Design a protein around this ligand. Sequence first.
Ligand SMILES: Cc1nc(-c2ccccn2)nc(NCCNc2cccc(C(F)(F)F)n2)c1Cl
Ligand SMILES: [Co+2]
Ligand SMILES: [Co+2]
Ligand SMILES: [Co+2]
Ligand SMILES: [K+]
Length: 304
Amino acid sequence: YRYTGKLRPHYPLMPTRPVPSYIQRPDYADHPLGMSESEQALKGTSQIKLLSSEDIEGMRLVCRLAREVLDVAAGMIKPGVTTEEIDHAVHLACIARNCYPSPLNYYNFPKSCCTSVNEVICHGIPDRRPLQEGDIVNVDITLYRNGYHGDLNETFFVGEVDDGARKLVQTTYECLMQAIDAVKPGVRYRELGNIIQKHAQANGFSVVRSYCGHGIHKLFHTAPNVPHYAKNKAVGVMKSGHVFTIEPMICEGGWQDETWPDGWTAVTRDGKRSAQFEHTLLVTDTGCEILTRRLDSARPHFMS
Ligand SMILES: Cc1nc(-c2ccccn2)nc(NCCNc2cccc(C(F)(F)F)n2)c1Cl
Ligand SMILES: [Co+2]
Ligand SMILES: [Co+2]
Ligand SMILES: [Co+2]
Ligand SMILES: [K+]
């Protein structure tokens, strides 16, 4: 395999981390290939769940706990710390909140969160590589509690970063916030990509096409599929009680992605940097509730 940039996987991984049996598990946790039968049963359907009162409270809880875990990860971002170390802390933090780390064994994904450095777009596998000053790194967290998944991610600076990294990260966050600002009953899902691409393009950046936002609730990924790029053909209209993510991945160079031999790590084909931010959203009568909002600060970690 010809790698697209400087990053390489750093093996072996530590033995898979166990989740105590008292923590409730999603269907795929114990499937040999990590397949989710509940998800497969709805594969290719475009109908969107309207959450019940009980569902909304369940989503509120797991989304709050997921934010807590992302904040744990944020505190560990420094030169020399390996992404494996971040994942261990994350794994323990999920357990401490009586949650299952949703990525663990999801379609055999080996770790409990995704750590995406520099040219990795998404789905980076936590490994023995120490973070380097100048790096940017996304940590993507999803927790499962009482039948519900909650999903967020932020990109972080490792020590001092160059002006381009600052611009990419700032712009990506601005893309996310502009899209969220447009969310309310009656807006088409396909509209969000128009807003996101307009802003990214205005700042000399491109928009990943192969990976999208998604419905989430009792399933990790379900309808709607939410592309982040302009003139896309996403199906559906926002309604009060819909829950979904917006998680735009934006790139310094071209939009094209490819996957490492590990079957997971998505990287820019040109080896230039990519950044991502993600929230889980609940559509309300007036707009939307950001379920994964940071509670003790108005701003994401990179600003702070
Ligand atoms: C957005 C997304 N994320 C993850 C994932 C998987 C492991 C850890 C974190 N995230 N898995 C996903 N899909 C799991 C089912 N298999 C598929 C199907 C189509 C496309 C993909 C892929 F690889 F994400 F593009 N995976 C998706 Cl759609
Ligand atoms: Co994912
Ligand atoms: Co995520
Ligand atoms: Co997501
Ligand atoms: K990245």
